[PDB]
Structure formats: structure tokens, C-alpha cells
Amino acid sequence: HMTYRDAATALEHLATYAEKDGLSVEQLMDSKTRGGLTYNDFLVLPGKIDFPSSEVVLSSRLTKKITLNAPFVSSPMDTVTEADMAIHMALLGGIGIIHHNCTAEEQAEMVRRVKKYENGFINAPVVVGPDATVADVRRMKNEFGFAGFPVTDDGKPTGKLQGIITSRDIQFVEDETLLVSEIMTKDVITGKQGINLEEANQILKNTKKGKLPIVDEAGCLVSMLSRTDLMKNQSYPLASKSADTKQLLCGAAIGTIDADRQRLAMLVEAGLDVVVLDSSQGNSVFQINMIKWIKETFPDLQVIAGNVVTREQAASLIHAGADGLRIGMGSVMACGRPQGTAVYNVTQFANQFGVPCIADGGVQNIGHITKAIALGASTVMMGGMLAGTTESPIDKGSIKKYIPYLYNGLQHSCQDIGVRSLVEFREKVDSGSVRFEFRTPSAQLE
Amino acid sequence: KWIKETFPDLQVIAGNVVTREQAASLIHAGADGLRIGMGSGVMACGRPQGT
Amino acid sequence: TYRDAATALEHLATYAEKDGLSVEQLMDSKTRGGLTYNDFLVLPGKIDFPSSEVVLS
Amino acid sequence: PYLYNGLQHSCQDIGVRSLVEFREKVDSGSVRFEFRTPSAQLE
Amino acid sequence: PVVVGPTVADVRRMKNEFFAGFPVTGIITSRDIQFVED
Ligand SMILES: Nc1ncnc2c1ncn2[C@@H]1O[C@H](COP(=O)(O)OP(=O)(O)OP(=O)(O)O)[C@@H](O)[C@H]1O
Ligand SMILES: Nc1ncnc2c1ncn2[C@@H]1O[C@H](COP(=O)(O)OP(=O)(O)OP(=O)(O)O)[C@@H](O)[C@H]1O
Ligand SMILES: Nc1ncnc2c1ncn2[C@@H]1O[C@H](COP(=O)(O)OP(=O)(O)OP(=O)(O)O)[C@@H](O)[C@H]1O
Ligand SMILES: Nc1ncnc2c1ncn2[C@@H]1O[C@H](COP(=O)(O)OP(=O)(O)OP(=O)(O)O)[C@@H](O)[C@H]1O
Ligand SMILES: [Mg+2]
């Protein structure tokens, strides 16, 4: 009996409403009405799905000149990012920022291993000298779990290669005091530095040998291939690499004190790609001077300044020449800002100048990542949620599984919202197509 | 659309939706009812159920 | 097309207000009265001096 | 002294050289504030 | 004196259960099956 509208007019009828359902980003982030928000205070509303999640592209600008295939950045914490974390973050499409709670020499070495790392090779081989006993070798086999040790004249990883000693050589040996030199293979098949993974593998098939030490023109060991390792066949088609040298990208943090000017020189000399100026209140004369000295002194270095939480801070450090900004303060404290409000107001100002911003702090799951980007962040930094992983200095497993899980999770969230890439996500938020809803305390518990 | 053409005596409830635009889309497609709710069963995408 | 970084400071004048709330806007009984210290934060400004120079008279 | 030094640093972060200056800048609108939602406090 | 007569994947499973030095009933050991693709 009662009269309803014809279903065929349903789409036409959406035009009778003054606004799309939900709030635009500007309406959500109103300081007067709704105050400082964090990620947990709101949601992104779903849109229309007309594509699979596998098609979503997550390219993200880290700096004006550096672009990553994933918006993930590991934090410069001594519990999070050292050389091992930076290598795998780069391999999986992001980047690591090595901490500076160490000597300048130690930091430069860690940067060096990242820049020199070659996938598929044992880049830091365990070695033994010739004057050691079989008993010494066997002890190493139990502690490390592998026995394939090349022997160098000085017993150091970079010494001149004399031979190779493996488990097969020492399994049945009597008289444990005998030296490695007596038992070892003197004539070692090797490969020249610069051989590629395919070329090295074929040599192992031809020679049916377990290991292939790699030596330089002076005969010093550089790396080694394990036949077992290639059999896993791990590939990294999203690896983050420098444009010029095609080496893995590497980042590093420093302070603004005078001693850190020499610290950074050592990092640049190790091949550092991007430096993060590490400070809780970055809008200072000390950091501004530091930015200007870097841009004139190291012409090929990208600089991320911070931390900032306000538009005024952002404008100051952009004027000084920053290549990116790091957003966050305290996400009890007197000075700071709720992270969501911070990201929105900085990035709304900074994105007009093309300065990408890292959202640093308060990220614990895929939901925080999506919301951080939704409010204007180009990349997101991760600390606690990466601590405890295998590649960190709890028991969360390897980031080789975790980062793809987060990568896949961010693809699905983009699909639900209805955007095919982070570039499109940014445009749709800023045009008002993507909609948001503020959450009451009860809703969060729901 | 395939259901409404293939099974003439079958009623279809589509979902889940939480927004007007979602609802308008699935009604235009021919839904006989809608199922409302997203994230009430932390997550990035959803809406408080009452709203 | 992005804005020139050299204009960043000049561009702050295009906004009607500074980022954040003034104290008068924060302490509005009608909008959100009844605040304690834990209900707000002070936003940071610009550092151009060491902390040892601050006078607490 | 710990509290004395702590108040100096917080004044530095805000950008004021003295408590007299702190008062003047607040009352002129130069010092800015942000209201915290309950979720922000737990953060 | 365990032994196994005439595939390579079945020999990798028998090593886990037990030792891969099993004569064909004439010998196959771990070294032979370590890096076999098929
Ligand atoms: N010299 C080395 N330095 C570091 N890692 C090594 C070294 N030799 C082997 N490995 C690692 O040990 C693991 C096994 O490789 P491999 O199986 O080739 O060692 P093995 O010495 O061959 O052990 P087995 O006694 O089982 O023959 C791989 O992950 C490989 O990277
Ligand atoms: N790259 C190499 N060039 C020349 N000889 C090698 C090389 N690598 C290992 N050898 C020697 O050749 C023999 C086999 O090397 P392998 O490393 O294959 O033994 P294992 O790997 O120790 O035992 P398994 O092969 O059972 O894991 C050993 O005597 C070893 O010393
Ligand atoms: N190059 C410099 N020359 C002089 N003083 C400096 C320099 N760099 C930093 N400072 C001062 O040293 C103190 C710490 O600077 P930092 O960059 O460490 O800020 P923070 O990280 O906020 O310190 P905390 O972590 O204790 O808060 C600040 O008071 C800052 O003004
Ligand atoms: N065919 C077998 N039948 C019974 N026990 C065996 C057999 N092969 C190996 N073992 C057990 O392993 C011990 C040593 O054998 P060995 O270790 O010499 O062969 P492997 O175990 O095959 O060596 P790898 O496992 O290192 O290739 C024997 O003393 C016995 O306990
Ligand atoms: Mg081996």
C-alpha cells in the first residue's frame, strides 16, 4: 500500500543530499569543535570496490628525490635498526634508519655493510686462521651451526685466501691438536668480485662444490656463496636501491651537536643516502644551521628534519632546505601534540611544497598505518612493533614475513576505501571523496 | 544481478554496508534487503554501528 | 607542481590564524569547559637560545 | 634544581626566554594550545 | 641395519624419521640427495 521510490533512481537520489555521508578530512580535523585527535579516535569509511587488492600500488615518497615501493621506515632505535634491519627493510621495499647510540666509526661501519650488501651472498663470512686446531673448528661448528670456513692468512674475514675447511674434512680426523693447514684444501675454486648470483650458482653445479669464496684482485676474501642458500630462491623485486650505484638504500640518524658534523662526514663517506636529524623539538637555530651546512657541503645527500608537530615549525625547516619532515612529539608531557592532529596540520602545509613527511610514533598495526597516510603522511615510521623481530638487535619472527603481511594488509585497506594507490588515496582525501567518522569512547570499545 | 535473473523466486540480502553510498549502489543493483555493519564483530575501515 | 620552498615563511600569512588554539579559545566554558592540566598541551615554538639562559623569576 | 632545569627546557621548547615573556606571549596569542581527547592522554 | 630399495623425496622423509646412509636392496647417502632439484 505505502509508496516507495523506484530502485532504479537510487543513484540519482544521492544528488539530493547536500554532502556525501560522513565527514571530509577538514571537518574531522577541527581544533575548535573536536580538538586534538589520535588515530584511534576516527575511522575511514568504505567506498566502492572495482579491482583486486593485488593491483594496489604503495609507492611512497620518502624525500624530494627518494621514492620507496612501500611506506615503511624502521626507527633509529638501538632496539630496532642496525645493519641487519636496514638491509632487510630495503630488500622488502622500505628503508631503515640506523641509530646513533654508538660511535661514529661503528655507525659508519653499519652503513657500509648495508651499502655493500649483495643479496644471495654470505656478505659477512665466518673465517678461521691456519694455526687453529680441529678442536677449535668443531667448537665453531656447534656455536654457529655451519662448518664451511674459508681460511685466510691472518685469520680475518678480509685476509688473503689460503684454503677452505668444511665439515666433510673434519668429521673423521684423529689427533684434535692438528692444525687446519694440514687437513684443509689448498686449491680453492673461487669467483671474482662482481660475479652475479646466476653466474656463481652455475659454477657450483659444474664443480659440485658446497661453497664458492669470492676474492678481490689481491686475493682477499670479499664474500662467499652457499649452495644451500640459493636453493631457498628468495627474490626481492621491490628492493630499494640508489639511483646512481644501484646499491641498497640506507638511512641514518644524527644529532645537531657540533661533533655530529664530523659524524655525518663519516656516514657520507660510507655511502649514506638519507640522514634524519634526530631531535624532539627540531625548530631550532642549531638544526636550521645544520640543514644549510648539509645542503651546501654534501650535494648528493637528502635531509629529513624534525621532529615537528606544527605548521610554523614545518614552514621554518622547509625554508631552511629540508628534503622531508619527521612528525611527532610524545606520541604527562607539557609540550607536544596528538599525533593525528599533528600529521594533518603539518602535511596539509608541507604537501603544497612537495616535502614528504614521516609519521613517527603511535603506530602499532595496519590501522594506524592507513590512518596516518589518510591524514597526509607519505611514509610511516615503526619502532616498537618491529622490536623483537629476528632482524632487530618479543620473538615476533622475521620481518621477511611481517613486512609482506603489512604490505598486503595496506593493499586490502586501500581496496575497501576504493583507491588504487597511495597517490590516489591522497588526492581523494584532499578532494573530499574519502570520508571519515569520529569515534566516541564507547565506539572504540565496540 | 545474476541472482535476480537466474532465480526469480529468491530474495537477496546484500552487504555489509555502513554508508548511504554503499546502500544506494546495492539497491540500484536490485537488492531485496541490506545487512548493516562493519567492524563491530582497531580496524582502519568501518563505522560506529548506531550511526 | 609544488610551491617554492623559499616562499614557505611568507606563505604562513595566507592562514587566518596560527596553528592551534589561543588560550582564550582553549578555555571556553560553553564549548568544552572544565579542563584540568592533563586535558591539553602547549605547542612548541622556535628555539634560538640555550635553556640555561631562561629566567624563572 | 631538577624541576628548575626541567622548567627551563619546557620554556625553551615553547620558545620563551623568561616567565614574564611566557605570560606576554600567551596573552597575545603567540603561544598556542591543543585540547587532548581521552585517547590522546593514553597515547 | 636399516635399508631402502629403489624415490629421492621419500629418502629425504626417511632421514627425518630416523640417518640417511641406507643401502639399496646398492648404497645411497645424504651427500647424494642434498641438492637434487627433482
Ligand atoms: N662461512 C659461513 N659464514 C656464514 N654463514 C655460513 C657460512 N657457511 C655456511 N653458512 C650458512 O650456513 C647455512 C648452511 O649453509 P651450508 O649448508 O652451505 O653450511 P655447511 O657448512 O654446508 O653445513 P653441512 O655441515 O650441513 O654441510 C646457510 O644459511 C649459509 O649461509
Ligand atoms: N669452493 C670450493 N672450491 C674447492 N674445494 C672446495 C670448495 N668448497 C668446498 N671444497 C672442498 O670440497 C669438498 C666438499 O666441499 P663441501 O663444502 O661440498 O663439503 P660439505 O659441504 O662440507 O659436506 P655436504 O656437502 O655433505 O653438506 C670438501 O673436501 C671441501 O673442503
Ligand atoms: N649544535 C648545538 N649547539 C648547542 N646546543 C645544542 C646543539 N644541538 C642541540 N643543542 C641543545 O641541546 C639540548 C638537546 O638538544 P636535542 O637536539 O637533544 O633536543 P631533545 O632531543 O629534545 O633533548 P631531550 O631528549 O633531553 O629532550 C637542547 O637544549 C638543544 O637546544
Ligand atoms: N642405516 C642405519 N641403520 C641404523 N642406524 C644408522 C644407520 N645409518 C646411521 N645410523 C646411526 O647413525 C650413527 C652413525 O652413522 P653416520 O652418522 O656414520 O651416518 P649419517 O648418520 O648417515 O651421517 P649424516 O647423517 O651426517 O649424513 C650409527 O652409529 C647409527 O646409530
Ligand atoms: Mg654443506
Side-chain angles (χ1 to χ4, degrees), chain A residues 2-132 134-135 137-138 140-155 157-159 161-172 180-182 184-185 187-191 193-197 199-204 206-207 209-232 234-394 396-400 402-444 446, chain B residues 1-42 44-51, chain C, chain D residues 1-23 25-42, chain E residues 1 5-6 9 14 16 20-24 26 28-35 38:
Chain A
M2 201 161 89
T3 174
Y4 300 117
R5 306 188 166 272
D6 186 359
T9 68
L11 295 177
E12 294 161 3
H13 192 57
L14 288 175
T16 66
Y17 295 80
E19 301 178 20
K20 283 188 79 185
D21 196 11
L23 299 179
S24 71
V25 65
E26 167 180 354
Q27 292 162 337
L28 178 69
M29 306 308 289
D30 189 349
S31 291
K32 299 184 185 184
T33 310
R34 183 176 287 96
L37 308 176
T38 78
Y39 301 141
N40 287 353
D41 295 316
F42 70 92
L43 294 170
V44 186
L45 300 188
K48 173 154 184 194
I49 294 181
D50 52 350
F51 53 89
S53 62
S54 66
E55 286 184 14
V56 180
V57 176
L58 303 181
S59 311
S60 305
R61 313 178 65 210
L62 181 66
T63 67
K64 287 184 185 192
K65 296 194 187 306
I66 299 177
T67 293
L68 310 173
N69 286 312
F72 309 146
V73 180
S74 71
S75 179
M77 303 169 66
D78 57 15
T79 49
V80 179
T81 307
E82 282 183 351
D84 189 11
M85 174 66 60
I87 292 165
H88 287 86
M89 285 296 292
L91 282 175
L92 297 160
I95 196 171
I97 310 301
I98 298 169
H99 71 88
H100 60 90
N101 189 21
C102 50
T103 66
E105 288 73 11
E106 291 165 342
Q107 200 181 15
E109 171 62 8
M110 296 192 280
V111 176
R112 191 166 295 112
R113 288 207 183 167
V114 180
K115 297 300 298 180
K116 283 259 216 164
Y117 184 91
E118 193 60 57
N119 182 247
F121 302 69
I122 304 173
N123 292 278
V126 177
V127 309
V128 62
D131 286 0
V134 177
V137 182
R138 295 185 180 151
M140 293 181 172
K141 184 181 181 179
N142 288 6
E143 177 178 1
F144 303 107
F146 47 78
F149 303 112
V151 187
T152 60
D153 64 355
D154 63 3
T158 51
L161 181 64
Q162 309 195 164
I164 186 163
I165 184 166
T166 68
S167 51
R168 183 187 305 180
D169 296 334
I170 67 172
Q171 175 163 209
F172 305 136
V180 177
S181 55
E182 301 197 12
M184 75 166 69
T185 304
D187 190 69
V188 181
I189 299 182
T190 68
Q193 183 183 7
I195 185 176
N196 72 13
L197 202 60
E199 290 171 1
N201 186 352
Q202 207 67 242
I203 297 180
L204 277 57
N206 297 11
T207 63
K209 300 294 184 183
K211 327 296 180 315
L212 184 65
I214 305 296
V215 301
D216 64 14
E217 294 295 299
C220 301
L221 189 68
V222 178
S223 59
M224 181 170 59
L225 285 303
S226 173
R227 195 168 186 191
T228 305
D229 289 337
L230 61 83
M231 293 309 180
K232 308 188 175 68
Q234 313 176 0
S235 53
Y236 293 101
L238 305 175
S240 317
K241 295 173 172 175
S242 309
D244 289 338
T245 67
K246 307 302 183 181
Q247 297 176 302
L248 293 179
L249 286 183
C250 191
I254 70 178
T256 52
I257 55 176
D258 299 345
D260 280 344
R261 299 210 174 186
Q262 181 56 22
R263 189 183 211 99
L264 182 55
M266 298 175 54
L267 299 185
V268 173
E269 288 154 18
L272 182 69
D273 303 283
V274 61
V275 60
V276 168
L277 302 184
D278 194 23
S279 180
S280 68
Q281 213 303 39
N283 193 23
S284 72
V285 56
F286 311 103
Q287 175 154 151
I288 289 169
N289 289 344
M290 179 77 105
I291 292 169
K292 284 174 180 174
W293 169 75
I294 295 167
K295 300 305 298 174
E296 64 195 32
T297 305
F298 311 104
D300 287 330
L301 184 62
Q302 291 283 286
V303 184
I304 297 169
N307 288 18
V308 303
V309 292
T310 77
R311 178 198 310 150
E312 291 81 19
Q313 295 175 289
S316 169
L317 295 180
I318 288 172
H319 184 259
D323 303 310
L325 297 174
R326 189 184 176 197
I327 298 171
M329 189 169 193
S331 67
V332 181
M333 295 306 314
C335 202
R337 197 174 202 178
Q339 181 65 350
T341 303
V343 173
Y344 171 75
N345 285 287
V346 172
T347 69
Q348 179 272 355
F349 184 89
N351 293 353
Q352 312 175 225
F353 307 74
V355 179
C357 298
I358 310 175
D360 177 20
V363 178
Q364 308 172 282
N365 53 56
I366 307 169
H368 298 148
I369 295 171
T370 306
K371 293 174 186 184
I373 296 171
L375 296 175
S378 301
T379 56
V380 303
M381 186 168 291
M382 312 155 62
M385 56 187 299
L386 295 187
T389 55
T390 308
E391 297 74 12
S392 69
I394 308 191
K396 315 184 180 182
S398 171
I399 68 170
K400 299 200 254 194
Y402 193 32
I403 287 290
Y405 165 90
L406 296 175
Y407 185 98
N408 177 82
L410 182 55
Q411 286 186 307
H412 280 100
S413 303
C414 285
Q415 187 192 27
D416 289 342
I417 301 172
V419 302
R420 285 171 164 278
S421 67
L422 301 183
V423 174
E424 187 179 20
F425 196 177
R426 168 89 289 103
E427 193 257 323
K428 291 306 182 64
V429 169
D430 291 352
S431 69
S433 175
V434 172
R435 315 298 287 179
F436 308 79
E437 192 76 54
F438 178 74
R439 302 240 276 172
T440 185
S442 299
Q444 309 183 17
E446 190 175 61
Chain B
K1 285 175 180 174
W2 171 75
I3 295 168
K4 300 305 297 175
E5 288 184 333
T6 304
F7 312 104
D9 288 331
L10 184 62
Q11 292 283 286
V12 185
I13 297 169
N16 289 18
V17 303
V18 292
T19 77
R20 176 197 310 150
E21 291 81 18
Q22 295 174 289
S25 169
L26 295 180
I27 288 171
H28 184 258
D32 304 310
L34 298 173
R35 190 184 177 197
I36 298 173
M38 187 168 192
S40 169
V42 175
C45 205
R47 198 174 201 178
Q49 182 66 352
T51 301
Chain C
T1 305
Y2 300 119
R3 307 189 98 102
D4 185 359
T7 68
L9 295 177
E10 293 161 3
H11 192 57
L12 288 174
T14 67
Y15 295 80
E17 301 178 20
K18 284 188 79 185
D19 196 11
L21 301 178
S22 71
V23 67
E24 164 179 353
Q25 292 161 336
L26 180 68
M27 307 309 290
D28 187 349
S29 291
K30 299 188 186 178
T31 59
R32 53 180 154 280
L35 307 173
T36 76
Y37 302 137
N38 287 354
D39 295 316
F40 70 88
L41 296 171
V42 189
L43 299 188
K46 173 153 183 194
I47 296 180
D48 51 349
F49 53 92
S51 62
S52 66
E53 285 184 14
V54 181
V55 174
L56 302 180
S57 311
Chain D
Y2 162 88
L3 296 175
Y4 186 98
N5 177 74
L7 184 57
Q8 287 186 307
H9 279 100
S10 98
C11 283
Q12 187 193 27
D13 288 342
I14 301 173
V16 300
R17 295 167 174 276
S18 66
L19 300 182
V20 174
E21 185 178 18
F22 195 178
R23 169 92 291 98
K25 291 305 181 64
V26 168
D27 291 351
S28 69
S30 174
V31 172
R32 315 298 287 180
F33 308 78
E34 194 77 55
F35 177 73
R36 300 174 82 173
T37 182
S39 305
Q41 307 184 16
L42 275 75
Chain E
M14 183 178 309
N16 299 8
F22 298 148
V24 174
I28 182 171
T29 69
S30 55
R31 185 181 308 175
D32 289 331
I33 65 156
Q34 193 172 21
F35 308 111
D38 180 356

